[PDB]
Design a protein around this ligand. Structure first.
Ligand SMILES: *[C@@H]1O[C@H](CO[C@@H]2O[C@@H](C)[C@@H](O)[C@@H](O)[C@@H]2O)[C@@H](O[C@@H]2O[C@H](CO)[C@@H](O[C@@H]3O[C@H](CO)[C@@H](O)[C@H](O)[C@@H]3O)[C@H](O)[C@H]2NC(C)=O)[C@H](O)[C@H]1NC(C)=O
Ligand SMILES: CC(=O)N[C@@H]1[C@@H](O)[C@H](O[C@@H]2O[C@H](CO)[C@H](O)[C@H](O[C@]3(C(=O)O)C[C@H](O)[C@@H](NC(C)=O)[C@H]([C@H](O)[C@H](O)CO)O3)[C@H]2O)[C@@H](CO)O[C@H]1O
Ligand SMILES: *[C@@H]1O[C@H](CO[C@@H]2O[C@@H](C)[C@@H](O)[C@@H](O)[C@@H]2O)[C@@H](O[C@@H]2O[C@H](CO)[C@@H](O)[C@H](O)[C@H]2NC(C)=O)[C@H](O)[C@H]1NC(C)=O
Ligand code: 4J1
Ligand code: 4J1
Ligand code: CL
Ligand code: CL
Ligand code: CL
Ligand code: CL
Ligand code: CL
Ligand code: CL
Ligand code: CL
Ligand code: CL
Ligand code: CL
Ligand code: CL
Ligand code: CL
Ligand code: CL
Ligand code: CL
Ligand code: CL
Ligand code: CL
Ligand code: CL
Ligand code: CL
Ligand code: CL
Ligand code: CL
Ligand code: CL
Ligand code: CL
Ligand code: CL
Ligand code: CL
Ligand code: CL
Ligand code: CL
Ligand code: CL
Ligand code: MG
Ligand code: MG
Ligand code: MG
Ligand code: MG
Ligand code: MG
Lengths: 279, 254, 282, 254
């Protein structure tokens, strides 16, 4: 019956499989995709979270980072009352609904906990706060805190780890202003696209991309993004699990900041899975 | 000019000189690294490309792996810059190499890009992923590959010889094996490979850190806005059957 | 005639009063700070139901209420039972002393529930800074026991027909004998409201007598008219009424009145809204 | 002089002149409002003080209800200011009245103070509660009372007639009833009494607020650093019986 099944799928034309693809999702959601790597015991011996803290990471150099507004892009694909064509000034009613779709497959009590931490209890009805709040929920749950977990665990088992936050909005960006620096919009700069004369980037963005291309290939060359010996600029300190240092990739020079959304990921990485496994 | 004819283990290739404000790099686009994963090979792990006679036209990008195409905002740039820019085909296991124009006389480190788009979309031939500027401004070797997305690369019925799952990752691994065997032909150093990727590509890089058979194929890792341990990049064997068997039912199978 | 309850009380009435006192603290269910053995009972007589239930369901039109807290409610209690605390040093507690202090400050609460307290109250950038942890525990106890109970009551009276005024008292008496780290501790506004600075023998500062004369006036005024403000002094800084939406209060200190919003709004959502839900579903 | 002799409903009183920097104040300290809750009346609701012959000496605070005396920091002002400054006695249900010296010719609003102390301690006689400055400053009548604390005020075997709980609160209500009937003899206005109290005094104010028989005895309420809904200010029935039974065990009562 198992081989009987796949044989029938192999006779279906490719586009019909693509048509029904999003239907197999369990519970309506955002930032969730039907067909992803499976923890089979072959390619992945165990869940990634298990593999991550009993791993072979000493001697490995890792460069990790996030954009300033990780969540915005995904809200227009499922969150109630969102669009690139208005301000997305949602109601509290819409905010609540969006939590259950931003954090799907989670108990009623767990969702109360998300609302507890991301609501502003002086201004629980304010649409602009609710908008950026739901952005942070989706951004922290899916990107920032999983990255922050990975960094410190690698660091703790002997990886040399460097961490950035990319917070520059391309003047070319077609997405509306309330999305900030959306998911995926550091790429153009890492690849030097500003250098293309066909494109309309600033002169001052051209120097930015050259500085990022320098960091990335300094890393590929040497495992250290830092300009070797160069003391004119601030140093980019490696991320440790104690001091938790990262840099801002900005049109300004390197600002070295401590703590990679610490209070949020305490909830996402430690308290929430306790709540989940006790209710 | 003569640096546009190069020979990998599979056979001969013909490339293109590409233009940059700083000056040219020379690129090889659409190199076959797998036998086309189709017909009975749909859902199966990739096989390595059988060798070829003649010279392979490695001058344009090859097809994009079959995928959903975003229709939310039609014509909108921010939406469309991620949509495929080549015809869709299941015949899509092709990779590309950019190398500095006067080919490096000494072995130079290799950057390997893995694109994202939540494991249901993406292609190595998008304009944002263009390697000419990084290779000209920094004189590294850049490789990017295509890998199967959606059901074509990740439908799994765990336990069956017929949809073992993760075959889109096995596609990436096959490509990394390719660079171990052949990046020397372009001036690259097989002992200095750095993976980088964004979104699901960052998740993929992460998984290669955690799968022993991939650890011999690179030495460093950059992960941009993604991680293997997040809540969306993995599913359990039981969920995978649930989602696989529902597609099959939604489609008339049994 | 005996029954058994009547037996019990008849015997207790034969003991000298001192005998009963010397065993009072010994009947508490566990180790704890800011817990007392013999308090009002929800018996259905005096209190027809729990005070919380009465508030939620009560109608308070025609009532004026004046409520407030001091800056550091919790600090006084820590020295009576929390590990590492003393009036006589800096009380720079360790993290393990802090975690143990949370089980004493929040007694009768599950492991998961105290995780949630540690989640809210530690600085996961500096999980071990002793000064930071001292203030954190001071906030855990003072929030849980005073401020969020007050803020819950005040929002509900206001929303259900009362007319409420709220303050935070945040002046530290120049004569205060407790150490600096306790700040403005529990009970140290009373001196000023009874105008004790006016007493020539107590050695208060001249500006402090003015402050007390001011504060007595707010209190008298409220008694007189249910409104602390002066009716014929419009241009004096108005004390607006606390409401559940805008959550306005004033700061009472040596500077002229200042309006603030939100009585530790973020903390009190945990104590008054989430924590109860957590104890129920587990 | 003749301002210091006053007759209330149950007999004559002689008060004292208190001096302040602003001027003098008439004070009547230690007025009995209940028959001593002693012997068989221990743990029972208070009974109104019956009338007396002669003039009661109302010139200094009466006794402090029996309580635990704190000894963490002996002799230290920050703790001693809350400790008893009179002898302990179960005979303690007395209240105090301060009134402006020239006894107000028109009815003055009246403030009634309920001391705090965790429901286990406190006394109306503490120096920090001296009403003389508030009266002289704002020309208002101020009343404060003692109420049984600890086991004597709040031990409860719920459902029994012999130890019914909350009699400390009932002491407070009796004193409010006394104000309603007698404050007008000092110049006070029974139709404008404001309750105020700190900590457990504040929780007490909250409870009169939520107890219909008290709610005709005051017009407005002030709560300082306490609320009836706090985790420490009430106890369940089962828990109160559990603590009353343990006290009796520790003390030898079968
Ligand atoms: C601040 O002070 C507290 C309280 O200690 C008291 O005040 C100090 C000024 C000292 O003079 C102390 O002697 C005094 O009691 C410190 O906490 C206390 O530490 C002592 C140890 O020095 C504890 O005593 C021990 O108790 C155990 C049993 O639990 C015995 O086995 C030991 O032999 C020893 O006697 C004491 O319990 C503890 N008090 C509390 C409430 O936890 C505190 O360490 C100090 N802070 C700093 C930063 O130094
Ligand atoms: C490059 C060369 O000289 N010869 C290669 C040969 O090494 C290679 O064999 C594969 O080598 C890799 C090393 O990275 C692994 O050890 C392969 O094992 C696995 C894998 O884990 O990748 C085992 C796994 O169970 C398989 N999954 C299945 C059967 O579902 C995969 C799978 O067969 C994929 O095709 C691998 O991409 O392989 C080991 O087989 C082969 C390619 O497989 O190519 C030669 O040219
Ligand atoms: C912001 O826009 C969304 C998206 O709606 C579309 O885009 C708008 C520009 C407008 O042209 C709509 O008519 C489009 O359908 C709004 O979400 C929908 O709003 C309509 C009515 O406003 C409602 O009938 C739908 O049910 C909404 N979709 C939901 C709830 O999923 C949203 O309301 C807009 N917000 C504001 C503040 O205007
Ligand atoms: O054999 C002696 C027993 O003594 C016990 O003492 C327990 C701790 C010490 C007592 C204690 C005091 N405090 C707060 C002190 C007054 C502060 C206060 C409290 C409530 C209020 O409303 C107000 C308002 N205005 O003042 N103020 N809390 N606890 C020990 O367990 C042990 O030594 C032994 O069993
Ligand atoms: O506030 C507390 C509560 O007390 C209720 O009252 C019941 C009082 C029972 C006795 C009683 C006395 N009195 C005469 C009042 C003085 C009248 C007066 C006022 C101002 C003046 O200037 C003059 C001038 N020259 O004499 N006189 N009436 N009854 C309330 O009804 C309830 O609202 C409240 O909660
Ligand atoms: Cl087809
Ligand atoms: Cl998406
Ligand atoms: Cl549920
Ligand atoms: Cl608002
Ligand atoms: Cl605002
Ligand atoms: Cl340079
Ligand atoms: Cl910082
Ligand atoms: Cl944070
Ligand atoms: Cl951040
Ligand atoms: Cl949080
Ligand atoms: Cl558009
Ligand atoms: Cl070279
Ligand atoms: Cl499973
Ligand atoms: Cl399952
Ligand atoms: Cl009124
Ligand atoms: Cl620290
Ligand atoms: Cl610091
Ligand atoms: Cl009103
Ligand atoms: Cl404010
Ligand atoms: Cl807060
Ligand atoms: Cl007589
Ligand atoms: Cl001392
Ligand atoms: Cl007068
Ligand atoms: Cl004093
Ligand atoms: Cl009664
Ligand atoms: Cl309650
Ligand atoms: Mg709400
Ligand atoms: Mg995981
Ligand atoms: Mg599963
Ligand atoms: Mg919390
Ligand atoms: Mg520190």
């Amino acid at each position: 019956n198992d081989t009987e099944l796949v044989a029938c799928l192999r006779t279906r034309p490719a586009q019909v499989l693509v048509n029904h693809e999003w239907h197999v999702l369990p519970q309506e959601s955002v930032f969730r995709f039907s067909f992803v790597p499976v923890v089979d015991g072959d390619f992945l011996s165990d869940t990634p979270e298990a593999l991550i803290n009993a791993g072979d990471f000493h001697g490995l150099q890792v460069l990790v980072g996030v954009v300033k507004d990780e969540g915005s892009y995904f809200l227009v694909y499922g969150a109630p009352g969102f669009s690139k064509d208005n301000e997305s000034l949602i109601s509290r009613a819409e905010f609540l609904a969006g939590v259950r779709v931003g954090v799907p497959q989670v108990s009623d009590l767990a969702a109360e906990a998300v609302v507890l931490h991301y609501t502003d209890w002086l201004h629980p009805e304010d649409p602009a706060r609710l908008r950026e709040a739901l952005s942070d929920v989706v951004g922290d749950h899916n990107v920032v805190c999983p990255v922050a977990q990975l960094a410190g665990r690698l660091a703790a088992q002997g990886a040399r780890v460097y961490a950035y936050v990319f917070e520059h909005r391309a003047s070319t960006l077609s997405w509306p202003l309330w999305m900030g620096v959306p998911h995926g919009y550091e790429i153009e700069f890492i690849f030097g696209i500003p250098l293309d004369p066909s494109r309309n980037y600033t002169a001052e963005e051209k120097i930015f991309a050259q500085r990022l291309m320098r960091y990335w290939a300094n890393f590929a060359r040497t495992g250290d993004p830092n300009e070797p010996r160069d003391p004119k600029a601030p140093q980019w300190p490696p991320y440790t699990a104690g001091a938790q240092q990262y840099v801002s990739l900005d049109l300004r020079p390197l600002e070295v900041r401590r703590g990679l959304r610490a209070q949020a990921c305490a909830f996402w990485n430690r308290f929430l899975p306790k709540l989940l496994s006790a209710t | 000019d003569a640096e546009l004819l190069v020979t990998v283990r599979g056979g001969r290739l013909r490339g293109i000189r590409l233009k940059t404000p700083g000056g040219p790099v020379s690129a090889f686009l659409g190199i076959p690294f797998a036998e086309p994963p189709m017909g009975p090979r749909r859902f199966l792990p990739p096989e390595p490309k059988q060798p070829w006679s003649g010279v392979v036209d490695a001058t344009t990008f090859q097809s994009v792996c079959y995928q959903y195409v975003d229709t939310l905002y039609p014509g909108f740039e921010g939406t469309e810059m991620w949509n495929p820019n080549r015809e869709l085909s299941e015949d899509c296991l092709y990779l590309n190499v950019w190398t500095p124009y006067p080919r490096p006389t000494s072995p130079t480190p290799v950057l390997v890009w893995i694109y994202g788009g939540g494991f249901y979309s993406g292609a190595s031939s998008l304009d944002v992923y263009d390697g000419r500027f990084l290779v000209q401004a920094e004189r590294t070797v850049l490789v990017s590959m295509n890998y199967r997305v959606g059901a074509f690369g990740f439908l799994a019925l765990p336990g069956s010889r017929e949809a073992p799952g993760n075959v889109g990752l096995l596609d990436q691994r096959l490509a990394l094996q390719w660079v171990q065997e052949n990046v020397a032909a372009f001036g690259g150093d097989p002992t200095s490979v750095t993976l980088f990727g964004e979104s699901a590509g960052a998740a993929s890089v992460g998984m290669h850190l955690l799968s022993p058979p991939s650890r011999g194929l690179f030495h460093r890792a950059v992960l941009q806005s993604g991680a293997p341990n997040g809540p969306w990049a993995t599913v359990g064997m039981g969920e995978a059957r649930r989602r696989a068997t529902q597609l099959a039912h939604l489609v008339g199978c049994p």
